[PDB]
Every structure is written in structure tokens, then in C-alpha cells.
Design an enzyme around this catalytic site. Structure first.
Site, PDB file in Angstrom:
ATOM      1  CG  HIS A  80       5.698 -24.161  23.437  1.00 14.69           C
ATOM      2  ND1 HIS A  80       4.753 -24.876  24.124  1.00 14.69           N
ATOM      3  CD2 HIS A  80       6.588 -23.832  24.065  1.00 14.69           C
ATOM      4  CE1 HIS A  80       5.338 -25.215  25.392  1.00 14.69           C
ATOM      5  NE2 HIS A  80       6.603 -24.519  25.398  1.00 14.69           N
ATOM      6  CG  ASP A 112       4.867 -26.147  29.612  1.00 15.97           C
ATOM      7  OD1 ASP A 112       3.946 -25.750  28.858  1.00 15.97           O
ATOM      8  OD2 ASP A 112       6.093 -25.688  29.589  1.00 15.97           O
ATOM      9  CD  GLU A 126      11.253 -26.880  31.539  1.00 16.28           C
ATOM     10  OE1 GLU A 126      10.549 -26.252  30.447  1.00 16.28           O
ATOM     11  OE2 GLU A 126      11.505 -26.149  32.507  1.00 16.28           O
ATOM     12  CE  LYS A 145      13.272 -24.135  27.567  1.00 17.02           C
ATOM     13  NZ  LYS A 145      11.930 -23.346  27.670  1.00 17.02           N
ATOM     14  CG  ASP A1028      36.215 -39.952  -1.423  1.00 12.26           C
ATOM     15  OD1 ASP A1028      36.522 -41.271  -1.439  1.00 12.26           O
ATOM     16  OD2 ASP A1028      37.368 -39.284  -0.968  1.00 12.26           O
TER      17      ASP A1028
HETATM   18 MG   LIG Z   1      36.937 -42.870  -2.401  1.00 18.90          MG
END
Ligand SMILES: [Mg+2]
Length: 1299
Positions: A80, A112, A126, A145, A1028
Site C-alpha cells: 500500500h 489518505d 482514496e 470501499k 480459432d
Molecule cells: Mg477462424
């Protein structure tokens, strides 16, 4: 960087605001990771970071070289801190000072970064991080958050006067950066680069001290220790394996890892498989000695005529050579009554009180004109009668929730398509096919005749069922005075005559062609409403059929009534014939390669017509390509034409012409022809085994022999992917992986196994045929195999494996069974395994899915990519080349993916990405596949016991001629090669990425040295899924005459892929375009440089499936889900409504609109109460017609009508017989919030759509280019040119602006 200019980008107006979540992906190419020396001591962490190698991208200047320290008190949060160092203006300003205090507990919480502007607006910044590779977590952390501060900020600001507050969040990982604050791309890429070196060090130091991870879960720890004790005490008897399964020897693996790759043998082969290619381009593209481009297309034209005449001749030599035939293509008679409310003559009167192939010359001129002039779309008179009045009633009621002018303008267009006669014909067929399918299974008394009179119409039937229950015989008769009109054609069946009656000739019909006769009237109203929009007409106008429309609604009416494969196949094969024509100058279009697949025995007067029109498309394309016209910054192609009936159109009108016979099913049709085929596609290459196990994993070759591979390559194509993983993710990727697997196998419970999954009851008992017959099979589910397991004290998956591996080794096979649906192509075969084998195979998936999930190309485990590789290629290429750079890509295929892969090399290619504890396991879970035994249907064995490949099977039976894949007497089929479909889905896709990353590194090293000694400049990209692929190369040539020599050079690189594949075991197909320019085609989506074309007609036809669900109002959550699929496929908001009204007509016809004798009641009932779960159909809104799901519609009717108060407290028959047998006055805003959770959001929508209730507009043209774009409200993506008020205005009709 800076933190104040960044805050100076956002502007808030009044109150609270959050913005919109935006994702930046890793697009630009980073440099190498710097040398890291980490030493943890009692005092703290000592860090040494070196100087990063320089890049022209100019990244990494932010991180500064040298030696530093981190205190051991703050080591647990290194990730952090190290990343956000620059933006860390650490001042620790509390919220209680700048804001009012309302005692919400958030006063202590200190964000922060806090930035106060001079005007008074505040920004709440933040910072967060994630370590997951799933883009679900990137949203989860952001949402939590948000929740962290949503409520107290609101509570404080509601008291504030003059309020302006914004919540700004950043989430950074090495996967992607999600932020609601605008940034330049580079400023997200540097954040990602820094996170890399932060996490690498956190891991490195994490090993030395266990207290650093002062966290984790008490429960999670148990799982890791649970699934770690298995992989150290599991022990499969090795010397018992090598004897049972033919080719499994653990020495082969210990020599794959240790021996290195033979570089003196690689650089030689790549030099012999090269000059093969270049000496084959010049021979078959006429490049020698020299010829102008105009002369070569004249040699090509005359070679395409020879090959097509030697095909037409040989098909004539074996045929009953004639040139006349009396037949009909539509076996039903043409009649059209007016809906109301010679032993054949005596036979009707009584109950009242070949194998040869035709020739390709046959004079088919009947069909040649029924496509031009036909009487199909002329509005018949009686658009107001019994049946159509019974539909107008049930359409008004459902459309009362809205009453605007758009509705009355779209419900009077649909009621005009329902009255044409091609629909009025189709309504009395689809009622007959509900009698034949009803009385299909009934009682037989020898010589029985059943008489039935169709309702709504004066027509009669005579059924006569047989014992086979796979046939039926009918014949119809009418009074010859009621037949008013007819359908005006010569493709129809000739009716016998009587002086006062008209009859027919007792034809017969199968029982697989009855689901297709019941979905007829609904697939016409979708084919009239799709081709009247593509041409240009509008729903609220009247016109005359423009004779480019007669042929398309005419052709669909013929293919769908002659239900055969091999006639819906000479169309879908027109796609690789016409797609050649986009091919670039240094090559020539060659569509002659499609001969073969086009030599079959014809058996009708239609397959003869579609074959001659198809060949003249092969001759015209081979003689000139689709020409390029670069008018604007965009590009356009000219000269396109329809395939069957030569025309001229644009692209989208052509691209949808393919896909004219598609339709889906799931009914598992059974007929001796279909089944006998599947067994033919399984045992093809089984008699081609090399029979010398020296090249199946032991050594190297040059010329492989149809099942073999060379090991020295599989080491050089695995270790070339491993680099590309080590740079995107940090080095030391392995340990982290080991954690993900162990926690994932450990916590898997036995109570959640996928049930309803079929399995196989095949064993030793079902092995001899004579003694097991008249004894049904009836395979069963998987829910019951979880029964006997919990009954012995096992609750964790990893404890049921140990007994499941021995239950196999004592047997000697896999015990598979078969199952096949009927949809003419797709995934028609399914391989079912027994239960003792699904358990040992569940393990090798989570082991092999967690390795695909960290690869750049592969697109089947990380779905987000499919889109983001081909679009982000423009920008990435522009940056390092500067505008003016060409594109030269390709798109490939493999022919036999299964049936062609030995099952080693899937176990050797996985054991390289694994941590050396599992090696004994996976090498024993595979090698279970090298002896299989598959059932064969019993009815198939019966007919066979008493021409191609069938006279071979019955020969192998009976103890005659010997064959290896079958055995004498026994009811099964052995095999010893190849994977299967859907079993090894994930490890096989990992072998594709290890290959494609061999090219991408081979081409790149080739562009680096030119031809004369210079260096071309380019950018290579690759993407591939299960089968493919694609390749994309962009260059930048300096001057003319180097644009000509640098384009001939590339043309080989993409050409030589065909010769280098057999060294890994992949065989390239003849459906793989090569060297197109500016256009590519990955899965089914064609990217024409700037225009994205997507075939819509595929999703419109597969929009009304027989709903196999129990309770009503669960059908409508399917119906209303097969709708958002089409809208994302590209379809107006005005058509997507006319596709909805056709789902309605289908629905009420399943509750018995024209089958049941009592329907006035169920019709008079639903008018009083409209609730679903009784059978009412909730319609959409004319605009925004497919956006919001079923809930929205249930809620927009929950606050208007009676529903409010009530809420204050075969396959065709059993879909019907289950269907008709089951038959404070408001809500406070507290309970609605409980039920409809976003009921505060819907009103942001419901108020906008009531602005456009009126029909008024103009006609415009704009931007001529389309792009996929995301819309959020549920998330739906609408294809459209580059809010909600803008989409609703543009997408109501192409070239029309509402309001
Ligand atoms: Mg193809």
C-alpha cells in the site's frame, strides 16, 4: 507526477457525487524488472533496487535506484505504501476539522489525501490494491470501499449548507486499473509498473518471517493443511500402471525436464521448411517469369472453368441419365379456405357415413421463377375472421399499461403481417402438425382409421398409425366449393379428383420433422420483419414488394419446408467461397479449393438448383476481387453481391445472407442414418497409428507421419511462453500459484457437486449382445452418486478421490456412452462418463484452469480480452510508428482438433508449469485415456445383425474380416488415441498458447533483420481461443518501391505457417483466409477496419425454444432472456418489439389456442385478472424495448393495476399437458424497497421514456461507422456510432431521429 493537477480535473455541482467507473487495461509495453535484493533482519527490511534498463517508452523514471530501508513495524503494509509514494503528501488531516460533526463514528477516519479548493469544492481521494487476477475483485474492492464512507458522508453533508462533495477511488493491480477519476493512460501504466516491484518484494520477504502476514483466516488455514497431506501420502502403484495402460513410462518425463533443447537441429529445419514455401507460392500464383496483374487473372479464370466441368461430368456418369421428372418440393397441397367458426374414392366414402441419384442437368425452371413472381405477400381479404379476431383481443389487453401513439403505430403494422397469405397458409399447417404429434403414440387395432375435423377450418384428416411409432399416414379432403384462393405455384403436390371432392395420396411423414412444422408461423413473421428493415422501408408505411424481397422471403419458405441436411449445407458453405476476394494484390483469390465437400449424390430438384447457382459464384469471384475505395479517413469496399441470386447490395446485407438455414434444437433425435455417421467420425485415424513408439515423445524428426511430434520443439515452445508470464506478473510467479490451487482443491465440499449431470450405467454385464437384449439402458443422473458417499463419512472432495482412483485401476478402461442432438452443425455430440471417472478428472481442471488464467493471449478463461486485443491494436501501433502504417493480417483454423492429439504431450506440456509435488498425480490421471470402450445403441445392433463403412462394421462383426477397433461379438468400440469433446477442454487450450507464442517470437526476430541487411519496423499481435486464432502485422515503409518489396516479404511469413504446424501435431484446414488487408475475423465477429459487422440473423431464428419448465411464469424469464441477446447483436428498438409480438403468438398456442376444444373460458378468465403464473404475457414498452429485464416489467405493472392489491398479502404434448392442467390497495416505500431493491433507480428511467410518447421525426445520415459501446443502468451493450436520451433517439430506426 502531481496530486493537485489531478484533483483539478474533477468538477462537482451540488450535493454528493461519485462519477462513473472506468477501466484502463495494460496496453503499452513495459521494460524489464530491476534487480531486487531483499534482506530481512531483526532491525527491519533492507532493500536494494538497481537501475532499470532504459526504454524508448520512457517508463520507470519514477522509481529511483539505490539502497533503502523499511521499519519492521510497517512491513505488513509495504504494497500500500511503496506504490503511492509520490501522491503521498502525508499530512494526516482528520475529517472532524473540515466538516461538521454529527456523531456517526467516522470522525476519526482520515482519508489518505484531502484537497480543498478555493471556490469551496472538496475531493475525497482514496487508494487501494488487489492481488487477484479476476476482474470481479477489482469491482468488489471498489464497491466495498464506496460503502466504507457512503453513509457518514451523506449524514454530515445533509446538514451542510451549500454542499459539494465528490468521492474519488483508485484501485490498481497488475491486471487493470479501475478509477472514477480521469487520468492519462500513462499515469495508470506507471502505477501498475510500480505495483509490480512492490508485490515482488512483499512476497520475497514474506517467506522469511511468518508473523508478517499477521492475518489470514482460521478456516482457510485448515484447507491448505487438509489438501497438502494428500499430495504427500497419495501413492499409485507405478509398476502396475506401466503394465496396464499401453504407453505410460515414468522415465519419459524425467528425460523431458532435464535434457536441454537441440539448437543445432532447430536452425536447420526452419531453413528447409522455408524454401518449401517460397517454391510453392511462385508455382501456384503464376509469378514466373514475369506477368502483369491483368494477365494473371486471365490464366486464373480459365483454370476455374476446367475444375468445375470435371466435377459436373463425373456426377453425370453415375446417374439415371434423364432430363425430366414429375415431382413436388412442397409435399402439401395449396389451399386457402375462409375460416368459418380407384379405391380412394370408396375408401373416403366409406368412413364418411428409385434409390438412384439424379443428374446435374435436369431442367429446373419451375423453381427458377417461383422466386421472382410469387403470390406470397399480397394481403388476402379476410383479415377479420375467427382466428385473427381471437388474437386481436389478447393483444389489446396486454398493451393497456401504455396507450401512447407509438404503440398504436406498431400494433397496426404487426396486424398487417399477420394477414398476408403466406401466414394464412401457415396457420392451418401448424394446427395439423399438432394432431399428428398428438395421436402419434396411441392404440392400434389392425385396420384402424381415426377421423378428425380441424377447427376454424373446413378440412378433414384420416390417420392410420403403425407399430413403429416412427411414421404416420394421412390424407385430406375438402368440398371443392370452399377453396377460394390458392398460392400460385408449380412446386406443389397434385391432388386426385372426385366430382364433388378433392383428396390426396396417403403420404407418410417421419416424426423428427414435427417440431419444425409447429414453429412455422412464428418464423415467417420474423423473416418478413427483418428483410423489410434492411432494405429501407419503415414499420408505419405501405408499399409494394420490391422484388429484392420476394426472393428472400421466397427462399426461406422453401429451405424450411424441405427439411434436409445437405441442402441447408450448400448455402452455409458459401461463406468461404465469397470471403476470398478480400485477398490482397501480391496473391490471388482462389475459391476453387472448395471442390470436395461439393461432390455428393444429389437426390432432389432443389439441391440441383442450389448447386448450379453456387458454381457460377466460384467463377465470377476467381476473375476479379472486391475493389477498395478509400474516400474518407475510412475505407470502403465496392462490388459486393448476394450469392444465390446475383444482385448488388452493401456489406451487412451480404454478411447476413450466409446463415439462411440456421436453427437450434436439443431433442436428441434418433435415426439409423444419423447415429451411423457419428461412429464414422470417431474411428477415422485409428488404423493410422505409427506402431513404433519412438517419435511419440522420445526423439526428434523432420517429416512426421500423421500422429507424431518432435520433442526438441515442445521444449522450445513451452519455454517461450514462460518468459511472457514472468514479465507481466512479477518473477516468482510459482509459489503464489501453489497457494491458489491448494486452497481451491481443499475447500471444495461434496454437497455442491453439479447435479442433473447425466452419467453412464455401463459395466462388464453389458458386454455380450445375445444375452442382453430386450433390456433397456436408461442412463441415470449424478445426484444419487452423492448419496452413497455421504453415507460413509466423507464431506471433503479430496477424501473421495483415493477410493475413486483404485476403482479404475482394477478395471481397465473408461466406460463411455454417447448422446446426440439434431441441429445441423455446432456441438452435436456429447460424451458421458461414469461416476468413478468424474472425480479423478475434476482435479486436473482446477490444476489447469489456474494456469491459463495468467496468460496474455488465451481467451477462454479470461473472457474480457476477446474485445480488447483487436481494438487496442490501432493505438499501440500508432505510437511507435507514426500515422500512415498498413495492416496485413490473417485468420486460421484446424481440421481435426480431437481425434488427432496423442495424450502424451498434454501431460508433458502441463508438468512444466507445476511445483514438483503433483508430478506423480497428473501423469497418472492422464494415461487413463489410452484405453477406452464406448457403447453402441441396441436398435443399431439389431438391424445390423440380420454401402460405405456399413458393410465394414457388419463385416467386423460375425467373426469375418479382422479389424482392430472393434471385436467379435462384443457390444462396443475400442480406441487408443485422441482426446474427446468437452473432457479435456482446458489443458488443450493451453497447448495452443504455447505454440502461438513460438511464432510471435519467431516473426519478431525475422523482421529485425531485413532482406538486404536493413531492418523492417513492425508490431505483431496474436490472439487465440480453443480452436480459432488470428495474426496481425503492421509495417511502416519509408518510400515507394520499398512499399512493394516489404509487402512481398511479409506475404511469406503468413504463408509458411502452413508448413511449420505438423511439427507440433496441428493440421491446418482449407477454411483459413490468408493475407487480407484491413479486415480480420476472429470468432464470428468481422472487423472491417472501422465498421464492426455482426451476423444478426443467427439470433433472431433461435428466439423461440420449446420451453421445458414446470411452473408458469418461469417460462417468461426465459422468453425475456432470449431477447436481450438479439439487441446486443445489433437490432433497432423498433424491430426488437416486432420480435416480441411473435413470442406472444407462440406462447398462447402452447396452452392450446388451436388444439383444445374449450378455450373461450381460459380466454374469458385472464381478462379479469392479468397476473403471470396463470398465463398472461407482460409486454415491453415500444421504445427501450429490450433493455430492462423481467423485473422492471413486473414492477411497472405492480404500481398501476389490479396486481397491486393481489400482491398485498414427443415434447410438444407434455409441454401442453402440463400447461393447461395446472389451471391497503398499494405498497408503502418500505416494503417495495425490500422486494424491488433498486426501486429508487427505475424511476430515474421511467420518467425519461414518457417524454418521447409521440411519433415525429426526420431523416438523416451520420458517421457511416459502428462501434461496440457499453451502457450502464444491469449492464447492456448496444452496437452504435461512437446517456439514455441519446441512445433512445438514435436506435429507434437506422437513419431516423425520434423527437
Ligand atoms: Mg477462424
Amino acid at each position: 507526477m502531481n496530486l493537485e493537477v489531478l484533483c483539478g480535473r474533477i468538477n462537482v455541482e451540488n450535493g454528493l457525487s461519485l462519477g462513473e467507473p472506468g477501466l484502463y487495461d495494460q496496453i503499452y509495453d513495459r521494460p524489464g524488472l530491476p534487480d531486487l535484493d531483499v534482506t530481512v533482519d531483526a532491525t527491519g527490511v533492507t532493500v536494494d533496487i538497481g537501475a532499470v534498463p532504459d526504454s524508448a517508452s520512457q517508463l520507470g523514471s519514477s522509481i529511483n535506484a539505490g539502497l533503502i530501508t523499511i521499519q519492521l513495524s510497517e512491513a505488513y503494509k509495504i504494497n500500500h505504501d511503496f506504490t503511492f509514494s509520490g501522491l503521498s503528501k502525508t499530512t494526516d488531516r482528520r475529517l472532524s476539522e473540515v466538516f461538521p460533526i454529527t456523531h456517526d463514528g467516522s470522525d476519526g477516519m482520515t482519508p489518505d489525501v484531502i484537497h480543498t479548493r478555493l471556490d469551496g469544492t472538496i475531493v475525497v481521494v482514496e487508494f487501494s490494491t488487489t492481488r487477484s487476477h479476476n476482474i470481479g475483485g477489482l469491482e468488489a474492492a471498489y464497491r466495498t470501499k464506496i460503502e466504507k464512507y457512503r453513509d457518514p458522508i451523506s449524514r454530515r453533508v445533509d446538514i451542510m449548507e451549500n454542499p459539494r462533495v465528490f468521492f474519488g477511488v483508485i484501485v490498481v493491480s497488475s491486471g487493470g486499473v479501475l478509477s472514477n477519476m480521469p487520468l492519462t493512460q500513462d499515469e495508470a501504466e506507471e502505477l501498475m509498473y510500480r505495483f509490480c516491484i512492490a508485490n515482488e518484494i512483499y512476497t520475497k520477504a514474506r517467506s522469511m518471517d511468518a508473523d508478517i502476514e499477521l492475518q489470514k483466516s482460521e478456516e482457510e488455514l485448515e484447507a491448505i493443511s487438509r489438501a497438502l497431506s494428500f499430495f504427500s501420502l497419495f501413492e499409485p502403484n507405478i509398476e502396475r500402471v506401466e503394465g496396464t495402460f499401453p504407453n505410460s513410462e515414468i522415465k519419459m518425463l524425467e528425460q523431458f525436464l532435464s535434457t536441454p533443447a537441440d539448437v543445432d537441429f532447430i536452425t536447420k529445419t526452419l531453413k528447409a521448411k522455408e524454401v518449401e514455401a517460397y517454391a510453392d507460392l511462385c508455382d501456384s500464383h503464376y509469378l514466373k517469369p514475369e506477368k502483369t496483374i491483368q494477365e494473371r487473372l486471365e490464366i486464373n479464370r480459365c483454370e476455374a472453368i476446367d475444375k468445375t466441368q470435371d466435377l459436373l461430368a463425373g456426377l453425370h456418369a453415375r446417374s439415371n441419365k434423364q432430363t425430366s421428372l414429375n415431382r413436388g418440393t412442397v409435399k402439401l397441397p395449396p389451399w386457402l379456405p375462409k375460416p368459418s367458426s380407384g379405391a380412394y374414392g370408396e375408401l373416403w366414402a366409406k368412413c364418411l357415413l428409385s434409390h438412384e441419384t439424379l443428374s446435374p442437368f435436369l431442367d429446373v425452371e419451375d423453381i427458377g421463377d417461383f422466386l421472382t413472381f410469387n403470390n406470397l405477400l399480397t394481403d388476402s381479404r379476410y383479415g377479420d375472421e375467427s382466428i385473427q379476431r381471437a388474437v386481436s383481443i389478447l393483444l389489446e389487453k396486454a398493451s393497456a399499461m401504455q396507450d401512447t401513439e407509438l404503440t398504436h403505430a406498431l400494433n397496426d403494422s404487426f396486424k398487417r403481417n399477420l394477414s398476408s397469405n403466406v401466414v394464412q397458409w401457415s396457420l392451418w399447417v401448424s394446427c395439423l402438425a399438432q394432431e399428428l404429434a398428438s395421436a402419434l403414440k396411441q392404440h392400434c387395432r389392425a385396420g384402424e382409421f381415426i377421423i378428425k375435423k380441424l377447427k376454424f377450418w373446413p378440412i378433414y384428416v384420416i390417420i392410420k398409425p403403425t407399430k413403429s411409432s416412427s411414421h404416420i399416414f394421412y390424407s385430406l379432403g375438402i368440398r371443392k366449393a370452399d377453396v377460394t384462393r390458392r398460392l400460385t405455384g408449380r412446386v406443389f403436390s397434385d391432388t386426385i379428383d372426385a366430382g364433388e371432392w378433392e383428396l390426396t395420396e396417403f403420404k407418410s411423414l417421419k416424426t423428427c420433422k414435427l417440431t419444425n412444422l409447429v414453429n412455422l408461423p412464428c418464423t415467417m413473421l420474423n423473416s418478413i420483419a427483418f428483410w423489410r428493415e434492411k432494405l429501407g422501408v419503415a414499420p408505419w408505411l405501405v408499399r409494394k414488394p420490391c422484388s429484392e424481397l420476394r426472393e428472400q422471403v421466397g427462399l426461406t419458405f422453401l429451405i424450411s419446408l424441405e427439411d434436409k441436411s445437405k441442402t441447408e449445407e450448400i448455402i452455409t458453405l458459401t461463406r468461404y467461397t465469397q470471403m476470398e476476394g478480400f485477398v490482397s494484390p501480391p496473391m490471388l483469390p482462389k475459391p476453387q479449393k472448395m471442390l470436395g465437400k461439393l461432390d455428393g449424390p444429389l437426390r432432389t430438384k432443389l439441391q440441383v438448383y442450389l448447386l448450379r447457382k453456387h458454381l457460377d459464384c466460384m467463377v465470377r469471384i476467381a476473375s476479379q476481387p472486391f475493389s477498395l475505395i478509400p474516400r474518407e479517413g475510412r475505407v470502403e469496399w465496392g462490388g459486393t453481391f448476394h450469392a444465390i441470386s446475383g444482385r448488388s447490395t452493401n456489406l451487412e446485407n451480404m454478411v447476413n445472407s450466409w446463415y439462411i438455414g440456421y436453427y437450434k434444437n436439443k431433442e436428441e433425435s434418433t435415426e439409423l442414418n444419423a447415429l451411423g455417421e457419428m461412429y464414422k467420425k470417431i474411428v477415422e485415424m485409428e488404423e493410422d497409428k505409427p506402431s513404433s513408439p519412438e517419435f511419440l515423445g522420445w526423439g526428434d524428426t523432420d517429416s512426421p507421419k500423421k500422429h507424431e511430434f518432435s520433442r526438441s520443439f515442445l521444449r522450445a515452445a513451452c519455454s517461450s511462453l514462460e518468459r511472457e508470464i514472468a514479465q507481466r506478473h512479477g518473477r516468482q510467479w510459482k509459489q503464489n500459484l501453489e497457494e491458489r490451487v491448494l486452497r481451491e482443491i481443499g475447500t471444495k465440499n461434496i454437497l455442491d457437486l453439479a447435479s442433473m449431470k447425466a452419467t453412464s450405467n455401463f459395466s462388464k454385464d453389458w458386454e455380450l449382445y445375445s444375452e442382453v437384449q430386450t433390456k433397456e439402458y436408461h442412463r441415470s443422473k449424478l445426484l444419487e452418486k452423492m448419496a452413497t458417499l455421504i453415507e460413509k463419512g466423507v464431506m471433503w472432495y479430496i477424501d473421495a478421490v483415493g477410493q475413486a482412483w483404485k476403482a479404475v485401476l482394477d478395471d481397465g478402461c473408461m466406460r463411455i456412452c454417447l448422446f446426440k442432438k439434431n441441429q445441423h452443425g455446432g456441438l452435436r455430440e456429447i460424451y458421458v462418463m461414469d461416476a468413478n471417472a468424474r472425480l479423478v478428472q475434476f482435479g486436473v481442471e482446477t490444476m489447469a484452469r489456474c494456469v491459463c488464467e495468467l496468460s496474455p493471449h488465451e481467451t477462454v478463461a479470461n473472457p474480457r480480452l476477446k474485445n480488447s486485443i483487436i481494438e487496442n491494436h490501432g493505438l499501440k501501433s500508432a505510437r511507435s510508428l507514426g500515422p500512415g502504417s498498413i495492416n496485413i493480417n490473417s485468420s486460421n483454423d484446424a481440421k481435426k482438433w480431437n481425434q488427432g492429439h496423442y495424450t502424451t504431450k498434454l501431460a508433458l506440456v502441463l508438468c512444466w508449469f507445476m511445483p514438483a509435488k503433483f508430478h506423480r498425480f497428473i501423469w497418472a490421471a492422464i494415461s487413463m485415456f489410452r484405453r477406452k470402450k464406448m457403447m453402441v445403441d441396441l436398435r443399431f445392433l439389431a438391424h445390423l445383425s440380420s454401402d460405405p463403412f456399413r458393410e465394414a462394421m457388419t463385416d467386423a462383426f460375425h467373426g469375418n474380416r479382422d479389424v482392430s477397433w472393434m471385436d467379435k461379438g462384443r457390444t462396443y468400440i475400442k480406441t487408443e488415441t485422441g482426446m474427446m469433446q468437452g473432457i479435456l477442454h482446458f489443458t488443450s487450450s493451453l497447448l495452443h498458447s504455447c505454440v502461438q507464442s513460438f511464432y510471435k517470437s519467431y516473426f519478431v526476430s525475422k523482421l529485425k533483420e531485413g532482406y538486404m541487411g536493413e531492418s523492417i519496423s513492425g508490431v505483431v499481435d496474436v490472439i487465440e481461443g480453443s480452436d480459432d486464432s488470428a495474426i496481425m502485422i503492421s509495417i511502416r515503409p519509408k518510400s515507394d518501391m520499398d512499399e512493394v518489396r516489404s509487402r512481398f516479404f511479409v506475404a511469406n511469413l503468413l504463408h509458411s505457417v502452413k508448413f511449420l504446424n505438423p511439427l507440433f501435431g496441428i493440421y491446418s484446414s482449407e477454411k483459413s483466409t490468408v493475407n487480407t488487408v484491413y479486415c480480420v475475423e476472429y470468432n464470428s465477429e468481422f472487423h472491417f477496419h472501422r465498421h464492426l459487422v455482426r451476423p444478426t440473423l443467427r439470433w433472431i431464428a433461435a428466439s423461440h425454444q420449446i420451453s421445458e419448465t414446470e411452473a408458469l411464469a418461469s417460462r417468461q424469464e426465459d422468453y425475456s432472456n432470449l431477447l436481450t441477446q438479439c439487441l446486443e447483436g445489433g437490432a433497432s428498438f423498433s424491430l426488437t418489439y416486432l420480435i416480441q409480438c411473435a413470442q406472444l403468438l407462440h406462447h398462447y398456442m402452447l396452452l392450446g389456442l388451436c388444439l383444445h376444444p374449450l378455450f373461450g373460458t381460459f380466454m374469458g378468465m385472464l381478462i379479469s385478472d392479468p397476473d403471470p403464473a396463470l398465463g398472461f404475457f407482460l409486454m415491453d414498452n415500444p421504445a427501450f424495448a429490450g433493455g430492462a429485464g423481467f423485473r422492471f416489467n413486473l414492477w411497472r405493472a405492480c404500481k398501476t393495476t389490479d396486481l397491486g392489491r393481489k400482491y398485498a398479502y414427443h415434447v410438444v404434448p407434455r409441454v401442453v399437458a402440463a400447461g393447461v392442467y395446472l389451471l391497503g390497495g398499494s405498497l408503502n416505500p418500505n416494503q417495495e424497497r425490500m422486494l424491488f431493491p433498486q426501486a429508487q433507480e427505475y424511476d430515474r428511467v421511467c420518467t425519461l421514456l414518457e417524454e418521447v410518447e409521440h411519433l415525429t421525426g426526420k431523416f438523416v445520415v451520420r458517421e457511416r461507422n459502428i462501434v461496440r459501446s457499453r451502457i450502464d443502468l444491469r449492464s447492456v451493450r448496444l452496437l452504435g456510432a461512437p446517456t439514455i436520451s441519446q441512445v433512445v433517439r438514435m436506435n429507434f430506426f437506422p437513419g431516423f431521429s425520434l423527437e
